[PDB]
Design an enzyme around this catalytic site. Sequence first.
Site, short mmCIF file in Angstrom:
data_model
loop_
_atom_site.label_atom_id
_atom_site.label_comp_id
_atom_site.label_asym_id
_atom_site.label_seq_id
_atom_site.Cartn_x
_atom_site.Cartn_y
_atom_site.Cartn_z
CG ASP A 1 -14.57 1.25 3.07
OD1 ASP A 1 -13.33 1.17 2.11
OD2 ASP A 1 -15.26 2.12 2.85
NE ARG B 1 -12.59 5.34 1.17
CZ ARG B 1 -11.64 4.52 0.59
NH1 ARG B 1 -10.93 4.95 0.21
NH2 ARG B 1 -11.93 3.32 0.62
CG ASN B 2 -13.66 4.88 5.83
OD1 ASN B 2 -14.30 5.68 5.93
ND2 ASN B 2 -13.47 3.91 5.26
CG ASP C 1 -17.56 5.45 9.95
OD1 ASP C 1 -18.08 5.74 11.31
OD2 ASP C 1 -17.56 6.38 9.01
#
Length: 265
Positions: free
Chosen positions: A133, A137-138, A151
Amino acid sequence: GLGYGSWEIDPKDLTFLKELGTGQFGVVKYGKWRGQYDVAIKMIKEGSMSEDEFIEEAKVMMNLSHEKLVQLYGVCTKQRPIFIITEYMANGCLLNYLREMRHRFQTQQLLEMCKDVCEAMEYLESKQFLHRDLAARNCLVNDQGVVKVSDFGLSRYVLDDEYKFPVRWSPPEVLMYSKFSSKSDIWAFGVLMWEIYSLGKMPYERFTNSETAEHIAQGLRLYRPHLASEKVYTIMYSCWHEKADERPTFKILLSNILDVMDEES
Ligand SMILES: CN1CCN(C(=O)c2ccc3c(c2)[nH]c2c(C(N)=O)ccc(-c4ccccc4Cl)c23)CC1
């Protein structure tokens, strides 16, 4: 100590200092471990995570140490809700950071953010560990403006069936057949480079996810952000070959980025 495994942190060792915000799993707090070490404390809402599977994976994740990966320090699993204890990143999410026009970034700073993420990804690739992912945003940003990938692999433990699937960061083989590989992380990385050079615009901002999927399937792509040089655009575009086997590795992308840093210094 006694009653705590290597991956387990005693919650009594935490001092809560401030609320950072609320993520998909719940509240995130800034605090101190044993009175002096900065930590982020992620509170995991009940029913949001495959907790037993995550705890077993946490053991592997703690062994993934790279200066450009947001470090996992441990988990507090004896209570409801469980806590995930990580490295503290004072400047928050890369996406919000890119969107703050006050920074007035130079393109050399944007390329350095790409190199930070690429080094973390090269490390994960060397350990055969997929992120699954990758997106702005990560990624998180520390007090020195260093970007780190967070993450990694956590999407495997999300219980919400809506995961809100990252259509805009996915290659044709993921959208068509759910074929995840090192090459789907490569595609996602190219989209992340585009997010960085576009100062946080949403990829395919005028399209819905369904339209994005159709556009990609027709062999069409994102195009050059105004801030990307021809060489930078060639690097992000190389992540989007229709054929997964024709996409570079993170080692090759790193070599490419270092070359552009030298040429366009
Ligand atoms: C304008 N503002 C000034 C001060 N800013 C912040 O205070 C700040 C804000 C969020 C986050 C942050 C810092 N640090 C973390 C960490 C971490 N490991 O340190 C993890 C997740 C998040 C996180 C990510 C998405 C949504 C909500 C959240 Cl909470 C944050 C940064 C930006």
